[PDB]
Amino acid sequence: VQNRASGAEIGRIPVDSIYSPVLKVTYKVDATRVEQRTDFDKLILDVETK
Amino acid sequence: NSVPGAPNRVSFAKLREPLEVPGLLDVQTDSFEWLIGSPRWRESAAERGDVNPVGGLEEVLYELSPIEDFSGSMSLSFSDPRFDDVKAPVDECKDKDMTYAAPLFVTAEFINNNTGEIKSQTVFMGDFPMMTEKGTFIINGTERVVVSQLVRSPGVYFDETIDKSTDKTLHSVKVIPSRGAWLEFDVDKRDTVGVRIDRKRRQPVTVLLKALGWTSEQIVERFGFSEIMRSTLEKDNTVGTDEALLDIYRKLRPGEPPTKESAQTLLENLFFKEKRYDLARVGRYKVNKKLGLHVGEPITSSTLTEEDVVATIEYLVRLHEGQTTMTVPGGVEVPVETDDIDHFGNRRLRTVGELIQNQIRVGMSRMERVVRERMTTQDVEAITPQTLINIRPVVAAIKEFFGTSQLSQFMDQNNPLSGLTHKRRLSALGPGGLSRERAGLEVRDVHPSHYGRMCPIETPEGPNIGLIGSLSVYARVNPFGFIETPYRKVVDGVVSDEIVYLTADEEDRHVVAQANSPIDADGRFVEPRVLVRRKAGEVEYVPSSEVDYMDVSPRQMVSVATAMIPFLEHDDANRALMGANMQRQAVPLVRSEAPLVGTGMELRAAIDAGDVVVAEESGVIEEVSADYITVMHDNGTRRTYRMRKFARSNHGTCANQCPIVDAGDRVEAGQVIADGPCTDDGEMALGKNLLVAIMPWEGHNYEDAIILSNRLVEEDVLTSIHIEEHEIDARDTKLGAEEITRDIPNISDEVLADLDERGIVRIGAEVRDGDILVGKVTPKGETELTPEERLLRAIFGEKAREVRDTSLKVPHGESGKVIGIRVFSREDEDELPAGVNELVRVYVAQKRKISDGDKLAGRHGNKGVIGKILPVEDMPFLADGTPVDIILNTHGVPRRMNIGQILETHLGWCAHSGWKVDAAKGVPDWAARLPDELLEAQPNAIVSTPVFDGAQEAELQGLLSCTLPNRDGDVLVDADGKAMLFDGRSGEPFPYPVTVGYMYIMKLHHLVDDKIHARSTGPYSMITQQPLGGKAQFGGQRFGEMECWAMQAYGAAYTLQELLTIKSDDTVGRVKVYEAIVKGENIPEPGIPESFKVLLKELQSLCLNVEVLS
Amino acid sequence: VTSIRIDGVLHEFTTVPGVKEDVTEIILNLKSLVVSSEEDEPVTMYLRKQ
RNA sequence: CCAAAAGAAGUCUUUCUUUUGGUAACCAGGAU
């Protein structure tokens, strides 16, 4: 945030802000495709926070 | 490798180089210390040219002295040039706008040749700018570079040109001297041998020969082997020496009465009296070598001689006769052949010392003219050597050279590599060289004599292509200005380690093999047949018994910038030229990162450029800080190194220096002790390693466009700092008393808040366009004697208070913090330009992130502007959730023939992940000749592939097959080098694997924020009332002739009429249309442009009665 | 973190006496903090070292 | 067309009146 936008002295140093706790996310699906056509998926979701 | 603290960068090189890369700034520094005559050069010449050591200044002073009058009754002589210590250090000179220079003194001695009264004095000859330890000059505070010039050497050049009318060969010869008069001998369509002295009509050679004192018997005695010379002599029509002299006088002296003494003396004056004709030492050497006259005698004397002229004529007639070789009486025989003027045996280099010597020479010529004119208008016995010398022309010549020239330029300081490339440049254009608009295509080519001497790749891409080149890595310039290259001589089939430097002619005589040949560990080629270079650059297969020499290494034909491209031989020359030229446009970033896959040239180029701090003496670090490093030497003494923090370069970039040592470490001599702008622990680091995918993605990387992750903006990966400089000064003026103050007329207080108590803004204050940086007022002038006001001023005491605020405002499109303020003043007896009381300089700094439209690039010429910057969630990501950073298009790679980027991507992935070749039972065959300790690497390993001896395709494939898993035992990239990506925007996996890896990309200094501009209305010109030009004023875009043709072709007459009248220079139309727009009315009709009326007035001023009828 | 204020410095492009890093590097190092607050309004945390 | 000063009205800050004040040519370097 620019120093002028807020009312701040010369000694203020605005800093870029990153408010994100999550670090890395991925997933993989285990699809079962049988010959009799009763199918379904299986989502395995992996979450890593800081 | 040979630096005491360099990082461990493991190389794929198979060969071993006998010779280390020379000092890369030796051209400049060894050319200047010859000019001033340092003891270092004296020793260097002693172990080489001890026959005649003399500097440039001593040569000039010896050729100048003595200065004598016509009677010869008095003389003046100069000797013993001497320098004092520099007036101030480098840093003070750069800070205070002072030229870095040293005083020069000479010993002038005046002798009266009729009284013998000798008068010696020490004469001050001015302040002589001195070169720093980095190859630069500091003139008026700025740092400059003198470029070496490629010219044509003086000598004799024979050439043949066919004839259209007769289809006959017509030979010719040109004797081009240094600073003299030309004379050409030629054979015309009729079988006769002519002459063109100075620049006149052809005359028979017999006339010149007789004028030289040759009887018609001697001519037919020696020149009796040719029908042409007999034919010319018979039809000569001139008998008697005096008649020939008179005819030459007629041709040369227009409208003057011919005589015997004048004709006898003028011919010898033009070519034999050495005051109006010089060949130098290079010209004399070249003439003697071409004609083979004086092989033994040393070169002392620089004028022509009758022997040379007769030998030239004989050579020309025998060349026309079709002879093979010719022997001249008293000299060894030589081959009779024509010359190539683009041969690097005929083009010499005028280095930084030669150019300054030439300027001192013209200055001294002017001074001696003044001296010998002043020696006749002063009475004798009042003359002292100080009253004859006028030093002003000499110092004027130096100022003219160092301020106004096409070879004295502002140092290129975009990044450290730019300056090193600037100091090793050979430009064929300058005063005394060819011109950019008048250069053909035969001088822009790459002659086969350039091998090892001028890099064929690195050259400008514009209309300067071929006219500016760069010196190769191993090349050196010999005492005559000819470039040399080391060769490893092979004696009887045994490749020795004796390095010999050969210039292009000697390299022509012998047969040279290649560096990457199969040496068998005992200096013996494996096979008898090897590629070589024969006389005219011909490449053949000679049995390995004729070979005389071999190159000291590959990478001998490339320059510094082109030696930093990995996998250069997999890229075509067109794209490698761009890749080399775009590496010196990269901007320094806030934090630097060394490439994962380099070539090993980065460390040497970083330490030789000079932007790093290097320990002068070994010792132990005592104190470290962001501002200095204190080293405690082994013997008592201590040294403190000060750092350049956030300093502006010539091109507005940051020039930080930060230490890379701690308070207890021990350092060694020559060890890098503090990084620089674009260095990472001593190695060049111009860009960053980004994870890349080589797929087309939704058309955003279409036609050379690029897609970036938003992580590179959040994490400040491609951020850079740019600094600006603003100047203003207070000057006396005839009215007097300019002042820097806060009391400015017609200005409120809200616009006087950031200013401190005495004008200048406060440090730390952010500014926008239009804000005042330095408050200043000047007298309003118009000193007027109005009765009441003047009578109040005079006796009553009313003050003038005439003020006109010429304040310093930050120009359009600029902003940022105020980081520094430098204020000079006359009160503190600072050295300021004459008539200036005060001078204040304000520095404004910005921090710029990467954004759409900014230009990026790799090292292989794969440029492109940033098309989009995607959020990190909608990007292709690996199976473990890792997004890619950059996406490059597929259609650009195979068509441009720069497949080196794909191999760099593969090796970058291998280096990032780390590998381990499994030598469980025997090393694999593909890893047989792979160097040891390359069979395994740790993650994030730095490797190097030299330019022409690096990683083979089989080795890359093998390394890809064996590469470590990341965290869990998952290998993301298979043996082909491709990965299965997920579509972060839809979610489904992409159907086919994609190529992923790590590429080293650079941020170029072509940012959008300097390129965007718009204007509704603004300032206009004065003579013609059209809008100005440029962003800093405001200015409009130009609607040229071609854009007018386009609109005429469309048929749009009203658009074209308004664009040229009520948008440019219809003075009433502008205001009327603005009013109509703001009030919602209809746009009015245009009038007459003002430029047409200006044209009419100029035509009338040329006395032409131009009138418009009705 | 939204902004900082070092007492002896006026802007981001300067140096602190005694500190091996400069203010830009200090800010880039602080850009790796992970902190969790519980109240909406801004709060300030102090750092003092000798 | 803008800035400053003074006077008047209202709003708590705009309008009306008066005065003062108000660019080029060279050389060089780049890009497509």
Curated annotation (Swiss-Prot), chain B:
DNA-dependent RNA polymerase catalyzes the transcription of DNA into RNA using the four ribonucleoside triphosphates as substrates. The RNAP catalytic core consists of 2 alpha, 1 beta, 1 beta' and 1 omega subunit. When a sigma factor is associated with the core the holoenzyme is formed, which can initiate transcription. This is DNA-directed RNA polymerase subunit beta. SUPFAM superfamilies: beta and beta-prime subunits of DNA dependent RNA-polymerase. The keyword Nucleotide-binding does not apply. It holds the Pfam family RNA_pol_Rpb2_2. It is an enzyme of class 2 (transferase). Belongs to the RNA polymerase beta chain family. One of its GO terms (biological process) is DNA-templated transcription. Its EC number is 2.7.7.6. GO terms for cellular component: DNA-directed RNA polymerase complex. It catalyses: RNA(n) + a ribonucleoside 5'-triphosphate = RNA(n+1) + diphosphate. The keyword Lyase does not apply. GO terms for molecular function: DNA binding; DNA-directed RNA polymerase activity; ribonucleoside binding. The gene is rpoB. Keywords: DNA-directed RNA polymerase, Nucleotidyltransferase, Transcription, Transferase.
UniProtKB/Swiss-Prot annotation, chain C:
It comes from the Bacteria. Belongs to the RNA polymerase alpha chain family. The N-terminal domain is essential for RNAP assembly and basal transcription, whereas the C-terminal domain is involved in interaction with transcriptional regulators and with upstream promoter elements. Homodimer. The RNAP catalytic core consists of 2 alpha, 1 beta, 1 beta' and 1 omega subunit. When a sigma factor is associated with the core the holoenzyme is formed, which can initiate transcription. DNA-dependent RNA polymerase catalyzes the transcription of DNA into RNA using the four ribonucleoside triphosphates as substrates. This is DNA-directed RNA polymerase subunit alpha. It comes from Mycobacterium tuberculosis (strain ATCC 25177 / H37Ra). The chain holds residues 51 to 100 of 347 of the full protein.
